[PDB]
Amino acid sequence: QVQLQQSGPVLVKPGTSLKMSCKASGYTFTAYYMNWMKQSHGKRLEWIAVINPYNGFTTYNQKFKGKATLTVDKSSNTAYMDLNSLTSEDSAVYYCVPYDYAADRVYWGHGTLVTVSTAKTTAPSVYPLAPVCGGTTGSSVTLGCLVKGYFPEPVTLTWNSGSLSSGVHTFPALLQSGLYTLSSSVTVTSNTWPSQTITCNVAHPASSTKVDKKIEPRG
Amino acid sequence: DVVMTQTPLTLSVTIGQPASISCRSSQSLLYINGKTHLNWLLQRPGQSPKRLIYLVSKLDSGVPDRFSGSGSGTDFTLKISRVEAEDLGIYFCLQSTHFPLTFGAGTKLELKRADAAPTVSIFPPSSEQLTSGGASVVCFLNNFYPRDINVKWKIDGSERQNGVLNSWTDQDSKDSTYSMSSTLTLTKDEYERHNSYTCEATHKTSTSPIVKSFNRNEC
């Protein structure tokens, strides 16, 4: 099956260069042109350039010519994109998108999230949120997890290592005073909790933070 | 450059009902072999884009037949025979006839369902945050509809607007609802200065609020 693996999210300073990678598998690497796309603020999409990995010949969008450089390493089935002269304008998700011309199929990577900023990496504090002390025997029970004061994006929150998926709402993060804050709620049956341990799992790659907060009955 | 102009930017539809998205290009997209390189993509919440239609009207593998595409000249149209949960997200048209490749702005396909009241849970600050010297009260307004909704916070019976932040999730695939998280940020000293904490969810004056409370003082 066609699989693309893109380099993880990064925080880089303005004025620097960045090289992203896109490792491909499940097809003959040289048979598909590799496109790169940019998405801004989770909506607007632009095509950057394409490389023909067979011969390494690249065609650029004039908007990005001189800004982006595409290369490949045939040996490792890996495509690269370099971005130079970085500004906050370059903060975006960057997708590698291989195009099989013989069959006419296209595939998209999971992208690489870039944050251009001079702000320093700050690890989040993670707090378990247990229901109120009181005895409302409602049919269901809602638990929460608060992830506050971190930078840059992203963060991965899961419940019970991702094995608990139903009844989850993870909220988009919000920025105030240079720091992100995010929350996630989980709703299970009254029978489930507290009698089964439920844990909030939070990873913030940039800070090497990985914490497990157990949700426990309060007071 | 070819300009792709999409309409509308957002489209709201009931399950089972048809949907019609248009994309119009600033020049002909006939290729030198007489084929028209017009692509349609869907990007579902949290995922990267995926092509659905290519060459105006040809479906990608295992794309359901509810989807169809038609094109006359410089005008191109995606149609969904009957919209289903899975269809939700942002649709983009993409020309790949002329370089650079260019995209429409995207169309947000929203679902109209029956009005639905929020499930409200209030959460005092965790004992860890208090040890830290901070204090946040979090409120979840879950699985409501429509997206429009208001939160009132009351401390010891006075309305509080300062230091409130609200995050909305994207529309829920399963049930077409929206969920929202309201965080009230305080100082430890201030939180300890007061006792009654109240979270209210109202959509309009003439609908009873859904109210959730606690008293810091008692269990």
Ligand SMILES: CN(CCCCC(=O)O)c1ccc(/C=C/c2ccc([N+](=O)[O-])cc2)cc1
């Ligand atoms: C190099 N080239 C033109 C080659 C024409 C002749 C040939 O195929 O040998 C080319 C063609 C198409 C592409 C990319 C097409 C594309 C990318 C992305 C998507 N998409 O839906 O995301 C659709 C189609 C890139 C380079």
